[PDB]
Amino acid sequence: SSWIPENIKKKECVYFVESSKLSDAGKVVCQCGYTHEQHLEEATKPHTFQGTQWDPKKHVQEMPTDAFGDIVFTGLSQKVKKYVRVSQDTPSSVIYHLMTQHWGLDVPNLLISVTGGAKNFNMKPRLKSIFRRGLVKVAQTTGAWIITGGSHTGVMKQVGEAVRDFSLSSSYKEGELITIGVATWGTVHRREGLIHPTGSFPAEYILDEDGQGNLTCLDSNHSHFILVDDGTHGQYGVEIPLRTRLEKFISEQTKERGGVAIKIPIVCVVLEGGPGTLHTIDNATTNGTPCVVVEGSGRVADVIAQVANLPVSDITISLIQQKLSVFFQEMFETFTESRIVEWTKKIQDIVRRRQLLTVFREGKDGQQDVDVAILQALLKASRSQDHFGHENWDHQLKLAVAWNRVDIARSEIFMDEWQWKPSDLHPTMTAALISNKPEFVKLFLENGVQLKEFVTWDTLLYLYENLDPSCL
Amino acid sequence: KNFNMKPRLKSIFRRGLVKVAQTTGAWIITGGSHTGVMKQVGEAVRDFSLSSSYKEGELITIGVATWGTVHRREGLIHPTGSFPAEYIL
Amino acid sequence: GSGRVADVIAQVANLPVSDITISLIQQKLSVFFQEMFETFTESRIVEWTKKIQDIVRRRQLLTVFREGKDGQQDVDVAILQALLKASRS
Amino acid sequence: ISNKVDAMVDLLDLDGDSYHVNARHLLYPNCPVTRFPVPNEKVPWETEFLIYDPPFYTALEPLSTIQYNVVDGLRDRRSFHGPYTVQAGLPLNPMGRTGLRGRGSLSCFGPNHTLYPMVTRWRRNEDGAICRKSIKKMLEVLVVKLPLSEHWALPGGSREPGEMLPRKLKRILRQEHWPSFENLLKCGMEVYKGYMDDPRNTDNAWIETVAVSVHFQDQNDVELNRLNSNLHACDSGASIRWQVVDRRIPLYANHKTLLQKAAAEFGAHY
Amino acid sequence: ISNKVDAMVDLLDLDGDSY
Ligand SMILES: Nc1ncnc2c1ncn2[C@H]1C[C@H](O)[C@@H](COP(=O)(O)OP(=O)(O)O)O1
Ligand SMILES: [Zn+2]
């Protein structure tokens, strides 16, 4: 409570230009997004003549944050949920510093990310079933961290409703999942009351979806909340670069096993979407994240599906208009000619990096939950990639034994070689025994790891430490 | 002394050895040394011979080696004959 | 599948002797002559083509036993196939 | 039966511009600017750029007393790709632009030269045995890292006039061996001379490269490798490590395409 | 088995004045 407003800062607009904009339903706006009545404390008055035209970055300076605490809702959920306010230029290093010992969160083991459409979405049954089943299967095992925005809209709300569908019946009870929400301070309905000078921490946020009007209310659905600010009011799509940078930083350098480096497997999955989803995928691909698209979601899945493995050159603008009439139907009105043509750069950028994008067939390929697609993406972008080393190999298998995919284990053997010594498979078979899947230990015995030197005194003590609580 | 082991090759070699040696009067010809599969042919020989109805030696395994390539030659030479022929391994 | 000698003979047994060149020997010198490359010299590498050619051109006295796809059993099938090929035919 | 019918099903079911994009790098590094979309059908100059509003970031037209694309002294002021073209008053960089004009926050005017050296030392275990590659001889190429950087950088850069040493080879490296390697560094065949796909180029200037490929028959080949290493002492770098730079080296994305063509320097299989 | 053989049968069977 004494480390923040000291190491985490905020960015605001230091003067007003009152450009002639009505902000739809409203009474005049600067361009800052706020009004003259509430535009900081001295920023309402003009600071001499800095400039007669608005461009944010040249004049803005830094002031500390004022939004921190833990949100407790009236009746929706009687539990503690932490939230922090972050700036746009804040490095991810200090943010990870905040997560580990300032919030009491352990090191991640999986960093699946979910992005999708907000207030432009539609529902069908078996897609919902697939999404929910994949969510609980990936989140209940290991220490997977699911990263998603902040809002209660569509599949974005359904990820959380699946979270509590699993959490209502849980042996450990309380919170077995760490779901982090990311949103922009500008796009928050009930900001009044979320600001405190030093700290009070009731952080009351009633979910009043009726009075939101134009800014979607924050969900009651994410365990941790990240609320970014850039100086913009009601502008979505601002946190796209920062989210990608943060997830990357928490991807490669949070563990030091082996004495050099450990790269935690990471996948971002997209369902439906629009321009903001396109920007998210583009920034994610530029940073170096494997991405998977679930086909059939609508209006975004097919376009990426039928350009993923196709050559980049033949993808023309004309092809974009032929793809603009079937899966850009309801969003054609908001798309203008100067705005339509931005859909070819980002798609080309994502496609030409074929090592970080895969398509998940809904009907004919991988007819199962999202585990097969996610692990295929991880093995394609982890083992076959020219950048990653040999240390993380031991971690793809530890991830795979949880997903009980032994055909993939057979497949991955043929291209890697553990010529040094087979003894590196003892730690993974320790976890295989607790996961209890016998095909993996059968593979281990047929590979030739001898059980004579495996079970040691400390090894058997650790195995006896992890009996199944269900049995007597 | 230049060899490596893997399980199912060992199983195939051993199974073939006992099946071919236990039936008929097959003579298995092999060198003299305890190294690798060269040692494993013999270890299969005693793996079969330890449990045998006729007992004693049901197999005739001949070893061929060069006198030059013998470690403990001292004591293997006799003028006419004493025949304890002690050779500690 | 045994290693460093089995594949080389396997993929030259039924192949024509003429196309087996010295260059083919060096392409076979990098994958199954890895640990023995140090002891093999240029004057000693080239002796690996005469003996292989001599064994191969007598196709009636050499056979290859597939570990996985042909004769998936103990060595009896391969041995009897060799005996019938070199005995009756 | 149930799984053999499955194994039976599978097999009887069977029985436009691709040009440089890295130059037009979105999210230009070291600058807070975003680009308008310039598709792959919009890479050539002849196509009409409907939304052409390029950035004007320069942290100026310093064209006075400096003849661009001309023969001005021993400055390498000529573009090797034939005559240049001008678009109204502002000339266009051949191949493509990247998003910076003039000189920018760089060292000085002229070209942002590059001069990549390389050193080889035999692998000592007990007498100097060689660990080959899977197929052919993979000679131990080696690179170094900049003292404060996230990437490995060879001791090269913009060639200072009259010196030919880009301030990084003569310093923070070996001592008392400077004159020896300078003669060798100007004796070799190039890997590529021309504009190259990097997100750190300029519209008014570009990179002219000089490269030399040299192999030492012994790790003690005079003072080039043995005495140079014996007289080299940094004593300031926080981290140091030595590895053979195979496909595992995280160099520039610029350098991978250069290496794809420079693999022919030795003819070995990478 | 009974319906997969049926699904198997189908595809290998294959694999003047107009005024
Ligand atoms: N390949 C490259 N081309 C141009 N600038 C590069 C570059 N790689 C890195 N830079 C940038 C990062 C440094 O902060 C900056 C320093 O530039 P400088 O040394 O002042 O001039 P110059 O780029 O001519 O050498 O160069
Ligand atoms: Zn304002």
From Swiss-Prot, chain B:
Q: What is this protein called?
A: Transient receptor potential cation channel subfamily M member 2
Q: What is the lineage of its organism?
A: Eukaryota, Metazoa, Chordata, Craniata, Vertebrata
Where it sits in the cell: the answer is: Cell membrane; Perikaryon; Cell projection; Cytoplasmic vesicle
Family assignment?
Answer: Belongs to the transient receptor (TC 1.A.4) family. LTrpC subfamily. TRPM2 sub-subfamily.
**The organism of origin for this protein:** Homo sapiens
Q: How is the subunit organization of this protein annotated in UniProt? A: Homotetramer. Isoform 1 can interact with isoform 3. This interaction decreases Ca(2+) influx through isoform 1 and suppresses susceptibility to oxidative stress-induced cell death.
Tissue and organ expression note: Highly expressed in brain and peripheral blood cells, such as neutrophils. Also detected in bone marrow, spleen, heart, liver and lung. Isoform 2 is found in neutrophil granulocytes.
* Domain comment as written in the entry: Contains two binding sites for ADP-ribose, one in the N-terminal part of the channel and the other in the C-terminal nudix hydrolase domain. Both sites seem to have a role in channel opening, but the interaction of ADP-ribose with the N-terminal site is absolutely required for channel activation.
Entire-sequence positions represented here: 178 to 266 of 1503
Q: Where does ADP-D-ribose 1 bind?
A: N2
From Swiss-Prot, chain C:
List the expressing tissues. Highly expressed in brain and peripheral blood cells, such as neutrophils. Also detected in bone marrow, spleen, heart, liver and lung. Isoform 2 is found in neutrophil granulocytes.
Tell me which positions the record assigns to the signal sequence.
none
Q: Where in the cell is it found?
A: Cell membrane; Perikaryon; Cell projection; Cytoplasmic vesicle
What's the family? Answer: Belongs to the transient receptor (TC 1.A.4) family. LTrpC subfamily. TRPM2 sub-subfamily.
Its assembly, as annotated, is:
Homotetramer. Isoform 1 can interact with isoform 3. This interaction decreases Ca(2+) influx through isoform 1 and suppresses susceptibility to oxidative stress-induced cell death.
Its domain description in UniProt is:
Contains two binding sites for ADP-ribose, one in the N-terminal part of the channel and the other in the C-terminal nudix hydrolase domain. Both sites seem to have a role in channel opening, but the interaction of ADP-ribose with the N-terminal site is absolutely required for channel activation.
Quote the protein name from its UniProt record: Transient receptor potential cation channel subfamily M member 2
Q: Could you tell me which species this protein originates from?
A: Homo sapiens (Human)
Q: Which gene encodes it?
A: TRPM2
Curated annotation (Swiss-Prot), chain D:
Topological domains on the Cytoplasmic side lie at: 1-270
Motif residue range(s): Nudix box:
157-178
Entire protein: shown range: 1151 to 1503 of 1503
Organism of origin is Homo sapiens (Human)
Family (UniProt) = Belongs to the transient receptor (TC 1.A.4) family. LTrpC subfamily. TRPM2 sub-subfamily.
Q: Which domain of life is it from?
A: Eukaryota
Per the UniProt entry, the effect of R171Q is: Abolishes channel activity
Task: Provide the free-text tissue specificity comment from this protein's UniProt record.
Answer: Highly expressed in brain and peripheral blood cells, such as neutrophils. Also detected in bone marrow, spleen, heart, liver and lung. Isoform 2 is found in neutrophil granulocytes.
Gene field: TRPM2
Residue ranges constituting the Nudix hydrolase domain according to the UniProt record: 121-265
Subunit-level organization: Homotetramer. Isoform 1 can interact with isoform 3. This interaction decreases Ca(2+) influx through isoform 1 and suppresses susceptibility to oxidative stress-induced cell death.
Q: What does UniProt say about this protein's domains?
A: Contains two binding sites for ADP-ribose, one in the N-terminal part of the channel and the other in the C-terminal nudix hydrolase domain. Both sites seem to have a role in channel opening, but the interaction of ADP-ribose with the N-terminal site is absolutely required for channel activation.
| Record's subcellular location | Cell membrane; Perikaryon; Cell projection; Cytoplasmic vesicle
List of residues binding ADP-D-ribose 2: L148, S149, D198, R200, Y252, N254
Name the UniProt record assigns to this protein: Transient receptor potential cation channel subfamily M member 2
